[PDB]
From a paper:
Here, we have investigated the transposition properties of piggyBat from Myotis lucifugus, the only known active mammalian DNA transposon, and show that its low activity in human cells is due to subterminal inhibitory DNA sequences. The piggyBat element in M. lucifugus has a single open reading frame (ORF) encoding a 572 amino acid transposase that is flanked by 586 bp on the LE and 324 bp on the RE. The cryo-electron microscopy structure of the piggyBat transposase pre-synaptic complex showed an unexpected mode of DNA binding and recognition using C-terminal domains that are topologically different from those of the piggyBac transposase.
To further define the interaction between pBat and its LE, we assembled complexes of pBat bound to LE44 and solved the three-dimensional structure at 3.6 Å using single particle cryo-EM. In the structure, both monomers of the dimer contribute to the binding of a single LE44 duplex. pBat possesses a large core domain consisting of the RNaseH-like catalytic subdomain that contains the DDD active site (D237, D309, D413) and a predominantly β-stranded insertion subdomain; these, in turn, are inserted into an all α-helical subdomain. The second major domain is a cysteine-rich C-terminal site-specific DNA binding domain (CRD) with a clear electrostatic potential density that spans residues S494 and Y572. The pBat CRD has a small, central three-stranded antiparallel β-sheet and binds two Zn2+ ions in a cross-brace mode, one using Cys3His1 ligands and the other with a Cys2His2 coordination sphere. The pBat CRD is not structurally homologous to that of pB: it has a different topological fold and recognizes a palindrome unrelated in sequence to that of pB. The two CRDs of the dimer together bind the imperfect palindrome (P1LE). The interactions between the pBat CRDs and the imperfect palindrome result in a ~ 60° bend in the DNA as it curls around the dimer formed by the CRDs. The core domain is largely responsible for the recognition of the GCGGGA motif and all six bases are recognized by amino acid side chains (G11 by R189; G-12 by R185; C-13 by D186; G14 by K134; and C-15 and T-16 by R497 of the CRD). The paths of the pB and pBat bound donor DNA superimpose well, but the relative shift of the orange core domain means that the tip of the pBat transposon end is also about 13 Å away from the nearest DDD catalytic site and 35 Å distant from the other active site of the dimer, a clearly catalytically-incompetent configuration. The configuration seen in the current pre-synaptic complex, if extended by flanking DNA, would prevent DNA cleavage, ensuring that pBat will not generate a double-strand break before synapse formation.
Author numbering:
A (entry chain D): 10 to 27, 73 to 479, 494 to 572
B (entry chain C): 78 to 284, 288 to 332, 341 to 476, 495 to 572
Write the structure that this text describes.
Amino acid sequence: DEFCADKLSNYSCDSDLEHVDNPPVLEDFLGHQGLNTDAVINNIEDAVKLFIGDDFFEFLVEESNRYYNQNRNNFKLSKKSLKWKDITPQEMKKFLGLIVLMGQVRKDRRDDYWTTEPWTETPYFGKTMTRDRFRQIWKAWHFNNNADIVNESDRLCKVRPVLDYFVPKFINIYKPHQQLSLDEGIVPWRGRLFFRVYNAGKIVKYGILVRLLCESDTGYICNMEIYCGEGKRLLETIQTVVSPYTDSWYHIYMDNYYNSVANCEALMKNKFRICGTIRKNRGIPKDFQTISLKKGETKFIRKNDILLQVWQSKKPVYLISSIHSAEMEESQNIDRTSKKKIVKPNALIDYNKHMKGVDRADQYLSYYSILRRTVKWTKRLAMYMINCALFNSYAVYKSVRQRKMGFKMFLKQTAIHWLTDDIPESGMRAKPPTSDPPCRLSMDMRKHTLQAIVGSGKKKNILRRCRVCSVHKLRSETRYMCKFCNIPLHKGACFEKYHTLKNY
Amino acid sequence: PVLEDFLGHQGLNTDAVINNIEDAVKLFIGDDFFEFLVEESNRYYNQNRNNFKLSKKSLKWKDITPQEMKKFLGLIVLMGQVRKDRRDDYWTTEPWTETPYFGKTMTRDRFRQIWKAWHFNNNADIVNESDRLCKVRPVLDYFVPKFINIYKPHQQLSLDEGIVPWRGRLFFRVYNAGKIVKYGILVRLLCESDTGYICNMEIYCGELLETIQTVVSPYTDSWYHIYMDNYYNSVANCEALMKNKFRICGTIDFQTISLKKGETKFIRKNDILLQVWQSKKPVYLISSIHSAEMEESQNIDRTSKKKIVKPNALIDYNKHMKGVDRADQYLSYYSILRRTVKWTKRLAMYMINCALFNSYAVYKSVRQRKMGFKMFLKQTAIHWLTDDGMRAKPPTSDPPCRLSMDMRKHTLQAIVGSGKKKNILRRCRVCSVHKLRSETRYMCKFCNIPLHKGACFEKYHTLKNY
DNA sequence: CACTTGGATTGCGGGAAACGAGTTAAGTCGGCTCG
DNA sequence: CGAGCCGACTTAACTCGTTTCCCGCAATCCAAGTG
Ligand SMILES: [Zn+2]
Ligand SMILES: [Zn+2]
Ligand SMILES: [Zn+2]
Ligand SMILES: [Zn+2]
């Protein structure tokens, strides 16, 4: 349904590609920054504006008009109208707002929202933009220069400038809690880029590698990086991720598959503490590689302040930590045969608590279901990024002013706001008839108002012949005259026609 | 070596005039179904008339008549075309997510009063509830016999369980590790392997060969081939099933412990092949439908060779076992869904979807045209909502489009009354926000808001606050 | 023994849609006038 | 030498009371995701 011009969008891709004890750390520093914001919010609209706003729209509008012109030759297929260069920021808000709004009423195709079919009608869309205008903008929705990069068949730089817009805001609006975590999220949308072979764990993901750093209690996104490289940059996994957060003693909980003991020193150099799983083909002392435990038994070894522990489950469970002592404690778990509960290393219990109630932004991706089937690669990625920005706006809103809402309502209200244009810009002849004024076709409801006619004779409730009716040689009287220009007019259509039409 | 060919018949067993949607559906669902639902719904409500605390301003109860029940289902089915997340938000008056059609079909409270009464059994009259399913029993009874006598399946059949998801109080909470639903009602059913047509049913209910033989019962004495998964067959079952003239193929003599990769050995006894192949695990194959052979086939998956050599039995097994999912996978997520507390409603809804599915399969058998199930369902809802003096809604919030200054769109039209008189006035929206009752018969044609001439109309479009 | 959330499920009530009784505001048309 | 103002007559917008339901919130109790 769409065409590509640069041989990168939707190219070079295919289908179907889917020392025998352990002290706790005592040198636990809390010398960090406040868990707060750098901005003023009174309501939902103010919160949204910190991440998404008019400058976002200017960017989208400028690029959209440029793209269409460059490729205008295959629009020969035609359109009802061609003001395609005339997209302005106010139209683009409507374009985006309608897409977000669609998640509240979910239909199967984009083309079924703009319908006239009375059975499943949703009239608001029809009253906001026309069907063809939306499609024309859709084809023209584009995110980049399209003529600056000629040196390589990159297929990344195409969405790069969108990400560049949002990243500094995730960093400068809000700062996170002592505990952070890493993951790899993303939408199940049939994208076209496959690097599955380099994963270090996963959430169903499309297109490119995506790295998230999130606050452990709230789900706020602290950083994001995409397509870090094809496995070449996934080791030293967090070095490009937590860079702006160094020296803050954040504790990082992770489950990446490429951690190591050696890696832990790097984290200490940058003042981070970690907890996560460890692979066996790693710098694990050999004497701990050949062990046997009874179910529920643990073994602990340490070197320096790094604890390597094994708890025995169906699988031995390995955990590496630079935070906890090797102590056992009752967990909340109950065995099917025992109400006495199961005792586990405190580190494991703590680890699991901080890996949940996180990455809430990804949890809501199912909302934008319309973006799955027939979408160009770059549109899907840009939408992920917009959703992330809305999520962060919500989290801040809620954290600054405690109220109960939910992300779902935050989004509905935001869409209504964007879609609303609430910004304002004496003789025998009782009266000599006149010619039609030059202001006749000035379209303004603030000026062409209706008032009753007041006479000069004994009877003030005077009626006069309508000018429009005079044109057709009809005699019909009215009590009303246009106030702007003194022409007697009937109420209803004659007043509308006189001020609206070139003739009458 | 199957030497008896096939003694069945295929396709419609009835005079189904398949030239439209309506005549495909009525075979399974129709007016007598609704007569059943109405009779029980009116008895249920009145028999339990006390303890309702009906409020003062709601509508008074009126008994349910057949059209309302047809509307009732039609609206529920449409909710699958347009999805909203709360049952009562379909009646919202907010202009941006409005779906006005529902509002014009029946009111919110009427829908809630019918919903409550959508009952399936006269438990008040018959109290001999020894049967945990006695409350859905007549629903199950209504639909299954039709599946059997409308259409006959071709030679290859398969057996599996249907799924009705449910985390609340139920007959059982047993989960079979080889099944796809963690919890809910499991249904035992046969279907035709190519179309998914559902042929016969039983409900996992109450608490091997006794049920295998029972479900297949209407299909004995004709040489049907039945394909089975890990938990339905046995060697002994095969022997028994042969006595009723049908053949079995499926999965489930220690020598098989010996190992070989690539081509492997079989044990063959008494015309039953008991071959064991090896993949990640020993692959057991039992068959009374073909001779032993091993040959290549084109895999869907990428493989080391263009084609991979496998026991012929696996080649056929993995082509016929699709019938089970196409038979109802749609029905697990399309409408007639709830998070209700009545298990009876969830189960009854599953049964309704089976009937709609079978209607679709029949339709396609006759016509060469290809359309999905989804369109069959949408059109059905349209038909049921078609008719084989409602009050105007009050305003609740002022539309976001009122400030758009286009004098071609905003115009005064006279109100047209839905009641006895066409002329009827309404409260002026510009005056009632100051609690001044005053009445008018002119309205903005684009916005649907009542206004007075001039002084009110101008303010409503021009002023941010009025 | 859950954690968390929000959709069913339960009602209560501010307000106005509808109909008819009973007084007002704007229209039809004439036959005389000033352009 | 062209088309209207005062007056006497008809319809069409407005109060007011009164019954009857509209959907919008607001309060409890579990069923979905996965310790
Ligand atoms: Zn004017
Ligand atoms: Zn006129
Ligand atoms: Zn209007
Ligand atoms: Zn008014």
